[PDB]
Design a protein around this ligand. Structure first.
Ligand SMILES: Cc1ncc(C[n+]2c([C@](O)(CO)[C@@H](O)[C@H](O)[C@H](O)COP(=O)(O)O)sc(CCOP(=O)(O)OP(=O)(O)O)c2C)c(N)n1
Ligand SMILES: Cc1ncc(C[n+]2c([C@](O)(CO)[C@@H](O)[C@H](O)[C@H](O)COP(=O)(O)O)sc(CCOP(=O)(O)OP(=O)(O)O)c2C)c(N)n1
Ligand SMILES: [Ca+2]
Ligand SMILES: [Ca+2]
Lengths: 666, 662
């Protein structure tokens, strides 16, 4: 078959699958089919029979609406994605969801759909390869050596995140990153010139990318020459400007916004078959075409060669080889649990009244020698977030390092870290002030959706940060995280809860963990062995009374000290009170009914929440007959101690609100 | 006095105020003082005696951590910002908060601090000026003619939002936007080359900006020449690449990250006075320096001249002048309330089952002829969000238009719209799929913080959008808006609640309004006159029983129909059931306690919330002894009907959860 015929197999499967679903996006798959044919058939290093091969090239579809492009490719090349699944495009529990999802489709590297995040993930995967190669490769043993290829369109280019990640990719000289820009002149509103006029080549040259202009995206030879050129440039990421026609093949819809996001229609599909010379019926692919598309034999050969290379590496470098295998699997060191518990016990036994941002730094320092897989960073706030430890080495200085200066790029940082976690080999942590989680907010959600391990270090968590004022002082941000499916959020009240939360985060294999950390010093609380162990259960009894409490305080983070002070005052007056520390609502909610009842007994309705965060959240635990000492407004610019007074975070106010509650109950 | 001495007054005030507060950022104010002296003294058209003058130039400090820069400028040029306020920098309830805040302080145009948003706001202000000029200017009567100047640093340049708004600024040929880049090579982590290596000039030429390279940011002659060149280029926004030294004047901390964000210290301040040759004590400014800085006389002269121009315009164009005044004040047309009510009444009387995204478009169509101040748009989703009406005219085609194709730029769109609302003269609406509010999240918060009127049109609100799947299907986004201070959030259940929500949004004077709209068709509910009037109260009794209810459903948006069906089933069994429609929790919360008690009686604890969004929100209304039929997971890619079934949005499930309570 000709290259065009082979590319037309993608066009057929894509338009037919979309038609059967009566839903989806035929435009981009039809426009990019010739580019995909050259990349996948001539260049991509992969094994359909082992999508987890450590040294495979990584491909990312950043324009993820064109999901049938990737499903066509995976099916044709021989991945475990049968034709039946293509017939179930966009149907419940199929392996072919409307946008591609990592985890339950063989060969899909990341979940896209939110524009711009794919290219960010690709930058992360490229950083991962570069860093892993620098760490593990040895003279005569280049066990890490693979490319990262990304497809992206006008949507991804317009998004601010593309600026963040492509700027950084230039700084880091990611010579194995090669992106293809689907330059088709069309977006949903129509011809893009009304709203998008960048000289995109000049923009990417500004970033230090090697740009290849004016590629005929429908000519295999031209595409192939461009890929070879990009591969020859080893010191810059490459952007291939591929001029394509959206919906290529459709006489009436090619080059129109109409081909972007709806089925072509049966009449138009018939006309498209005729224009393309594609004779086969929907979901029909002949043996001869499978024979040319299939990658099983080449894939086997390439992975076998690599396995031999790795075996020779293991002989010459056994310790390094065992570390590489461990890290690629995402397994923890065998002695980590014991060593981390020893650290936590030491903290409980040796009180220190320090900011939880500092307690976080101390946990990084403690874990650093144990977790060589750390690849951490901050969005230009290293000295404020406290993300550096004694063994940190920035990758812009030494490629075998473990630290990334992300610059002022919260969204890019977080989506890059998603790429890092997806790649394998590393445990990323990222950091900024908690307020600026709002800049990165969808990338945080994407880590949760993709079940990725990433520790998110969010300092300066409340009005306790003081003078910087309401644009910086979080109020409603913690609540936003708490209600996010599969998110874990910890607001530790002292250095001990901080270390427990850090341990929880690094050991959490199936989703991310946000740490909510103070600028100001936090009092250490006394704990029995049982209480110390109970921190990990998310909510636990910290102070108690004999018999049923008349009053339960529920407090988090910096406000536990306040709640304990109120508890002491009320107790001295003969009130039967309890204090529950709730460092993690999500962990608490995951405990069984018996444990939750033991902490927050259903009989006790007089419950007082105390937290320098939005009050409305706390009805979840206090119900309609309790009280909440929280924030209901934005903050103010003033010294922290004056703000806490202003906003009612005082022993006198907490006591008064508790007594007022009890008077109402009585 | 010399220009350098005049600029040094900013340096002294800034380092001294930071020192007194033991908090704040002396670096950028010290680095930008010479640029500020040229801009403010030689070019800026403003009147300190009236910071609200319609035709003033707008200045924006996008690098807002350098707040003492703007406070020094406002004080020195004669605004109502006394020395005592500078001496109370960063102190509770002062007019000098750590980052500048609009409303707090005479002459502050916007609230900055979140990097990147200031330049976005400035792009919005320049869009507003260009559009207002095209709408209102007449031959011989150019009543709108002002510049938008912005200062910005490496942080703003690194942020993605700068790409979004500066790209669009280039497309829109905003020739009266002039930005000064504080090119000082330092950020918090240290020397920027480790993480920031863009050829920023080349980047901005790629956006179609006019770029002036290699300006000596410490040389008045160099700066003045560059501003003149930028003003002469009328068809492109301009970027001035100003090479400066952070903390200029400090022998030991100039050019270091140490000068960015902490007091210099008393010893270093003394050395800085010596290096600068500044001989005045903290908070001492001699009369000769005030004399050269003060702008009261020139400002009053310029504004008076404008007032005379406006009077002549008003003689020739009385209707247009009246509209200009109304729109600049943000006042509504006097008959808008009556006309909108008539529209709402018509919808109730003429039922239609349509998607609330379509009901939204219909409200835009009804209000369009009434609100010429609309400046609306969508982030490349016009045909899906349904933001165009018959009278929409895109400003890239017609400068006097009322519609912006924002492209795929949700964050930039929203912060640009903040600039539009801040400017005066317009009522912006913006739009995207609700999920992608997450891309714009901090700009949405900033609209609320700044008490700005903007209608945020968020369609495709739930699993009801179907096949696009979990990356697109909102679950927890509405809950996050609901708990945002000063945010109004409406999730209308039919075309009638949609129109009421739109009315509420445009009539807000002091904050933004998010509309939570469906992809799929919504049934219209029957309403009495009382119920119809009560939609605007955010929560109301839609279906009821005789006497005290034994069971209350609380439902929103697309789930009201489901709640009504459960209500009918239980009512037929003889349960005393009620349905409350809760289109806006914030509007409901603001009602008097007698009204709230009439809707959700305190004695009735058997409450069932029903909404295709995160369950945890609803404990606020159902407490510990109710039930919630909501989402607790991400969505799935499948047809909407099958998703509602899969996730428990069925009459059987709602009825079963209700029976569990009774
Ligand atoms: C961050 C972000 N923003 C907007 C979008 C939305 N978006 C997208 C979608 O949500 C798909 O992910 C929509 O196509 C959506 O499916 C339909 O509008 C649904 O229509 P309806 O039938 O419900 O009315 S794609 C996109 C603009 C397309 O620009 P491109 O130039 O990237 O697309 P091309 O490959 O040339 O067609 C845009 C703007 C996104 N996916 N991610
Ligand atoms: C969207 C966003 N991201 C990060 C920031 C943070 N930020 C800022 C601050 O939050 C101020 O708004 C911090 O300075 C903050 O006050 C301190 O870190 C507090 O220190 P601590 O005593 O609490 O430890 S500024 C900054 C980047 C600095 O780069 P520039 O090059 O813009 O600053 P320059 O004018 O040259 O000094 C950055 C990175 C922001 N304002 N907005
Ligand atoms: Ca396109
Ligand atoms: Ca700087």
């Amino acid at each position: 078959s000709s290259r065009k015929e082979l590319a037309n197999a993608i066009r057929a499967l894509s338009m037919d699958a979309v038609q059967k679903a009566k839903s989806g996006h035929p435009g981009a798959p039809m426009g990019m089919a010739d580019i995909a044919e050259v990349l996948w058939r001539d260049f991509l290093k992969h094994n359909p029979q082992n999508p987890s091969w450590a040294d495979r090239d990584r491909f990312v579809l950043s324009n993820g609406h064109g999901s049938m492009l990737i499903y066509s490719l995976l099916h044709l090349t021989g991945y475990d994605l049968p034709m039946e699944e293509l017939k179930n495009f966009r149907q419940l529990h199929s392996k072919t969801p409307g946008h591609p999802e990592v985890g339950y489709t063989a060969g899909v590297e990341t979940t896209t759909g939110p524009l711009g995040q794919g290219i960010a993930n690709a930058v992360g995967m490229a950083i991962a390869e570069k860093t892993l190669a620098a760490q593990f490769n040895r003279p005569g043993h280049d066990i890490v050596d693979h490319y990262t290829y990304a497809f992206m369109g006008d949507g991804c280019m317009m998004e601010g995140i593309s600026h963040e990640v492509c700027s950084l990719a230039g700084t880091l000289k990611l010579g194995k990153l090669i992106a293809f820009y689907d330059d088709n002149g069309i977006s949903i509103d129509g011809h893009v010139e009304g709203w998008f006029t960048d000289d995109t080549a000049m923009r990417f040259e500004a970033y230090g990318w090697h740009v290849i202009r004016d590629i005929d995206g429908h000519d295999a030879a031209s595409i192939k020459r461009a890929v070879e050129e990009a591969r020859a440039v080893t010191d810059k990421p490459s952007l291939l400007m591929c001029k394509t026609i959206i919906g290529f093949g459709s006489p009436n819809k090619a080059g129109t916004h109409d081909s972007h996001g709806a089925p072509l229609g049966d009449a138009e599909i018939a006309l498209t078959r005729e224009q393309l010379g594609w004779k086969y019926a929907p979901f029909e692919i002949p043996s001869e075409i499978y024979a040319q598309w299939d990658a099983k034999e080449a894939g086997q050969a390439k992975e076998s060669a690599w396995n031999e290379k790795f075996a020779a590496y293991a002989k010459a470098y056994p310790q390094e080889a065992a570390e590489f295998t461990r890290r690629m699997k995402g397994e923890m060191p065998s002695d980590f649990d014991a060593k981390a518990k020893e650290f936590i016990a030491k903290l409980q036994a040796n009180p220190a009244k320090i900011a939880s941002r500092k307690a976080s730094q101390n946990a990084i320092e403690a874990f650093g020698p144990l977790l060589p897989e750390f690849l951490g960073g901050s969005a230009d706030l290293a000295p404020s977030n406290l993300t550096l430890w004694s063994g940190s080495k920035a990758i812009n200085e030494d490629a075998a390092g473990n630290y990334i200066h992300y610059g002022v790029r919260e969204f890019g940082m977080t989506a890059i870290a998603n790429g890092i976690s997806l790649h394998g080999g590393f445990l990323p942590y990222t950091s900024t002030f908690l307020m600026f989680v709002e800049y990165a907010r969808n990338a945080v959600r994407m880590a949760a959706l993709m079940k990725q391990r990433q520790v998110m270090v969010y300092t300066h968590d409340s009005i306790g940060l003081g003078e910087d004022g309401p644009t910086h002082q979080p109020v409603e941000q913690v609540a936003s995280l708490r209600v996010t499916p599969n998110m874990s959020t910890w607001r530790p009240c002292d250095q001990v809860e901080s270390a427990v939360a850090w341990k929880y985060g690094v050991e959490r294999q199936d989703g991310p963990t946000a740490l909510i950390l103070s600028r100001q010093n936090l009092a250490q609380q006394e704990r029995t062995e049982e209480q110390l162990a109970n921190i990990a259960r998310g909510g636990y009894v910290l102070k108690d009374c004999a018999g049923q409490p008349e009053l339960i305080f529920i407090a988090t983070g910096s406000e536990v000290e306040l709640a304990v002070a109120a508890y002491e005052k009320l107790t001295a007056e003969g009130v039967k009170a309890r204090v529950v520390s709730m460092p993690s609502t999500d962990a608490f909610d995951k405990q069984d009914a018996a444990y939750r009842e033991s902490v927050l007994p259903k009989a006790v309705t007089a419950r007082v929440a105390v937290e320098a965060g939005i009050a409305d959240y706390w009805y979840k635990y206090v119900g309609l007959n309790g009280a909440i000492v929280g924030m209901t407004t934005f903050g103010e610019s003033a010294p922290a101690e004056l703000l806490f007074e202003e906003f009612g975070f005082t022993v006198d106010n907490v006591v008064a609100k508790a007594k007022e509650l009890l008077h109402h109950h009585h």
